[PDB]
Amino acid sequence: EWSYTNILTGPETWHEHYKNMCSGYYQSPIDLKTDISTLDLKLKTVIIYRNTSSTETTTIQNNGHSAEVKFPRNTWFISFDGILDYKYEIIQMHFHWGNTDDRGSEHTIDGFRFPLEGHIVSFRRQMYSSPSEAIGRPGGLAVLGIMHQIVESIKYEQTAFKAYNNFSGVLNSQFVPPNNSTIDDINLALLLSLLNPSRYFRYLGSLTTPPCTENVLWTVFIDPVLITREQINLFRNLPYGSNEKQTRMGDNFRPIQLLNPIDTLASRTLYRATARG
Amino acid sequence: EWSYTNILTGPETWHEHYKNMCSGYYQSPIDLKTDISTLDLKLKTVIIYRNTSSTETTTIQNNGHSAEVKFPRNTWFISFDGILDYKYEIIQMHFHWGNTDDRGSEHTIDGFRFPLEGHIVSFRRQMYSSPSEAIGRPGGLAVLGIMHQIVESIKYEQTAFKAYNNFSGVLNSQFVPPNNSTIDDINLALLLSLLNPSRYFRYLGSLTTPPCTENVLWTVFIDPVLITREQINLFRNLPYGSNEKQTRMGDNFRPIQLLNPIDTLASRTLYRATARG
Ligand SMILES: NS(=O)(=O)c1ccc(CCNC(=O)Nc2ccc(I)cc2)cc1
Ligand SMILES: NS(=O)(=O)c1ccc(CCNC(=O)Nc2ccc(I)cc2)cc1
Ligand SMILES: [Zn+2]
Ligand SMILES: [Zn+2]
Numbered sequence: 001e002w003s004y005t006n007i008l009t010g011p012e013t014w015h016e017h018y019k020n021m022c023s024g025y026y027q028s029p030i031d032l033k034t035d036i037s038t039l040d041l042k043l044k045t046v047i048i049y050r051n052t053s054s055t056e057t058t059t060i061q062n063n064g065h066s067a068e069v070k071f072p073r074n075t076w077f078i079s080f081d082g083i084l085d086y087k088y089e090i091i092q093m094h095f096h097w098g099n100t101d102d103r104g105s106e107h108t109i110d111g112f113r114f115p116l117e118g119h120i121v122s123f124r125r126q127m128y129s130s131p132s133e134a135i136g137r138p139g140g141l142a143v144l145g146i147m148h149q150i151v152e153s154i155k156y157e158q159t160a161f162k163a164y165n166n167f168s169g170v171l172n173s174q175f176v177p178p179n180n181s182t183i184d185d186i187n188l189a190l191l192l193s194l195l196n197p198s199r200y201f202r203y204l205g206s207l208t209t210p211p212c213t214e215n216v217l218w219t220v221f222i223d224p225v226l227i228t229r230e231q232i233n234l235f236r237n238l239p240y241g242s243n244e245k246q247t248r249m250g251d252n253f254r255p256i257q258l259l260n261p262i263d264t265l266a267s268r269t270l271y272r273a274t275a276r277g
Numbered sequence: 278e279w280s281y282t283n284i285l286t287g288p289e290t291w292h293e294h295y296k297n298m299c300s301g302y303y304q305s306p307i308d309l310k311t312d313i314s315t316l317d318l319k320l321k322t323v324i325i326y327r328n329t330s331s332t333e334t335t336t337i338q339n340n341g342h343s344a345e346v347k348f349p350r351n352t353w354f355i356s357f358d359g360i361l362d363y364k365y366e367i368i369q370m371h372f373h374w375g376n377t378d379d380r381g382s383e384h385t386i387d388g389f390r391f392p393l394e395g396h397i398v399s400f401r402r403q404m405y406s407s408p409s410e411a412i413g414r415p416g417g418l419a420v421l422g423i424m425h426q427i428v429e430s431i432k433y434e435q436t437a438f439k440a441y442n443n444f445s446g447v448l449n450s451q452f453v454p455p456n457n458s459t460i461d462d463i464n465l466a467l468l469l470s471l472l473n474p475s476r477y478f479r480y481l482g483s484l485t486t487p488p489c490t491e492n493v494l495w496t497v498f499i500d501p502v503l504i505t506r507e508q509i510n511l512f513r514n515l516p517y518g519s520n521e522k523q524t525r526m527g528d529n530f531r532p533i534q535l536l537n538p539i540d541t542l543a544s545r546t547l548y549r550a551t552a553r554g
Contacts, residue, residue: 034434049554082553102430112432149428149503153379155389157311158499189554194500197552199470222435223471224503226426275474276359277324277466 002210004065004253005246011254014210022212025264027257028205029106032220036259036270037201043273046144046197046219047079048090048120048188057182060170064177064241065209066252067167068094069186076188078122078142080219087126088142093186094119096208097235099250104232106208106253107145107201107220114224115232116148117253118160119208120188124217138215141207145220146191148227160225163191171234177241195223198275204268208254222272279487281342281530282523288531291487299489302541304534305482306383309497313536313547314478320550322475323421323496324356325367325397325465334459337447341454341518342486343529344444345371346463350408353465355399355419357496364403365419370463371396373485374512376527381509383485383530384422384478384497391501392509393425394530395437396485397465415492418484422497423468425504437502440468448511454518471502475552481545485531 002017003009014022056072069092076090097116098104105117122142123134134140148160156162165184175181201220206212238249260267279294280286291299298304333349346369353367374393375381382394399419400411411417425437433439442461452458478497483489515526537544 045552047553110432110434112435115430149430151426151428153392153426155387157387158389193473193476193551196470196473196500223500226501274470275322275324277326277469 001243003241003244004251005240005244007245009243014212018210018212020211021206021214022210024206024212024214025261026205026214026268027212028208028216028218029108029254029256030203030205030259030270031108031111031256032201032270034110034272037272038269040202040271040273043200043202043271044080044082045275046192046200047082047084048192049077049079049084050189051075051077058185059180060167060183061180062175062177062238062249064243066094066096066249067171067235067238068092069183070180071186078120078144080142087124088122089125089131090120090122090188091131092121093188094121095235096253097232097250098253099236101150101229101232103251104253105147108256109147109222114147115150116227116235118146118148120144120146136213136215139217140215141213142217142219145218146195147221147224149224150229150232151226152229154226154228158194158226159231160191160194160227161231163187163194167234171237173237173239176239191225194225195221196275197221198273199223200273202271202273203259278520280520280522281528282517282521284522286520291489295487295489297488298483298491299487301483301489301491302538303482303491303545304489305485305493305495306385306531306533307480307482307536307547308385308388308533309478310547311387311549314549315546317479317548317550320477320479320548321357321359322552323469323477324359324361324474325469326354326356326361327466328352328354335462336457337444337460338457339452339454339515341520343371343373343526344448344512344515345369346444346460355397355421364401365399366402366408367397367399367465368408369398370465371398372512373530374509374527375530376513378427378506378509380528381530382424384424385533386424386499391424392427393504393512395423395425397421397423413490413492416494417492419494419496422495423472424498424501426501427506427509428503429506431503431505435471436504436508437468437471438504438508440464440471448514450514450516452514453516468502472498472500473552474498475550476500477550479548479550480536
């Protein structure tokens with residue numbers, strides 16, 4: 001029993017209902033403050049790349065709290081080091097948005113909320129042979145945060161929804177929890193090409209939904225990808241699960257967490273990356 | 278004499294008034310066509326970098342056709358090959374925009390116009406000792422095209438105007454031609470980090486104003502940087518020169534040229550770059 005909008009099970013109760021680890025002091029999301037962060041020139045461009053000979057289908061689910069794309073095993077990867085050796089394997093991508101265009105993102109950048117934040121979830125295949133082995137273990141996960149911003153004038157083909165192949169038109173009011181649907185594959189390499197993959201915040205944090213496990217290497221790109229008002233409204237037609245008070249899915253984001261709450265026993269640092277320039 | 282808006286001296290006449298080289302078959306701008314272009318994986322990330330020992334001031338001028346930033350010598354460089362060895366030295370940056378938000382750019386991407394296109398102009402210092410030696414000679418110049426798009430919700434610090442330092446407030450009704458003003462330096466490395474510097478069109482073309490010299494290596498970034506309506510209307514406050522029919526500066530773009538007019542003696546190819554995938 002957790003929710004976003006039911007005050008009985010809502011984000012204010014997670015620290016009490018899931019003490020391991022929603023009561024911790026390495027929580028996400030955080031305010032990404034450009035002025036307090038440390039520039040680390042050794043942090044390299046992110047690459048996302050696909051196994052050519054992967055064949056299996058991708059699905060999307062209304063899980064009752066978000067829209068979640070489920071990727072097949074052994075097909076999408078992240079490299080942080082310029083080597084294409086399958087250190088990080090993408091599992092899923094899901095979305096957080098607002099009831100209105102001025103909020104939705106989990107992370108903020110200098111206090112600014114975006115209308116939509118996508119989370120590309122990977123496990124550290126370098127160490128862990130399966131996602132179920134990685135999800136609960138130290139240093140198991142690496143998530144990429146993709147900010148989206150609304151523009152009035154754009155060609156479909158230059159929007160993030162082109163990389164998503166419009167979720168194969170699956171997003172509507174009848175896409176009810178816990179239904180899944182097979183979809184055309186997401187071109188995650190095209191998605192990343194829509195922003196500057198050298199320019200990001202980096203820190204150690206947590207899952208943003210219970211149990212808020214403190215095993216996430218976070219990368220949040222500073223430059224947003226672009227969508228239209230019509231595209232954001234496609235997410236807002238989804239219905240929330242029945243444990244929610246609100247009917248239409250929206251405001252599915254966790255409140256901002258401090259980088260270093262007062263009970264921390266070892267402070268964390270927010271880092272930032274920029275291009276060899 | 279030439280203009281944009283006086284039908285006597287406007288772009289339809291340049292081929293007759295400046296046949297060297299506005300009558301050529303390697304003219305710019307062009308429609309940048311994603312489908313028709315050749316992906317060339319050898320084309321690398323663009324880097325812009327500064328001589329940190331440079332002290333000289335930058336100025337901006339209303340030249341009667343555009344707002345033109347004049348950089349000091351030996352200060353800003355482009356590398357296309359990852360070596361920081363001063364092959365390309367930046368001379369100036371100017372802008373093309375529309376009377377309205379749905380046009381202004383010189384290049385189109387699959388037929389789409391942006392409200393504002395910036396042109397970072399450099400000379401091939403690898404071969405030519407000065408801008409005045411390169412500007413009229415073969416292979417002398419390389420220009421970077423930066424598309425700008427209007428968003429409603431954004432912090433000043435994530436807009437292109439942060440890189441421009443608002444041009445020190447010089448964009449207003451009283452900035453009459455041919456006035457020049459000292460401005461804060463433009464952070465061109467920050468500007469380039471606002472988009473994906475690996476994702477671009479590449480072709481051989483021309484200056485877009487008389488005498489349309491065919492000595493320009495063009496790079497046009499596909500992802501736009503972001504601005505506000507308030508920021509685009511600052512450009513629209515500039516007065517046109519007395520050679521123009523319109524009073525306020527706007528629609529200062531050249532019409533689209535063909536990649537290969539029917540009279541070409543040697544076809545050119547449109548290339549496209551994307552990140553080491
Ligand atoms: N919002 S967020 O990015 O901080 C975030 C919150 C919660 C989660 C939970 C992990 N879920 C998951 O991927 N489990 C899964 C389980 C078994 C298999 I085998 C494959 C997948 C992930 C990310
Ligand atoms: N629209 S466009 O990008 O195709 C374009 C059109 C026309 C030109 C003009 C060439 N002159 C010049 O660079 N200015 C200048 C300033 C200071 C010095 I020292 C030397 C020369 C450049 C670019
Ligand atoms: Zn998430
Ligand atoms: Zn120009």
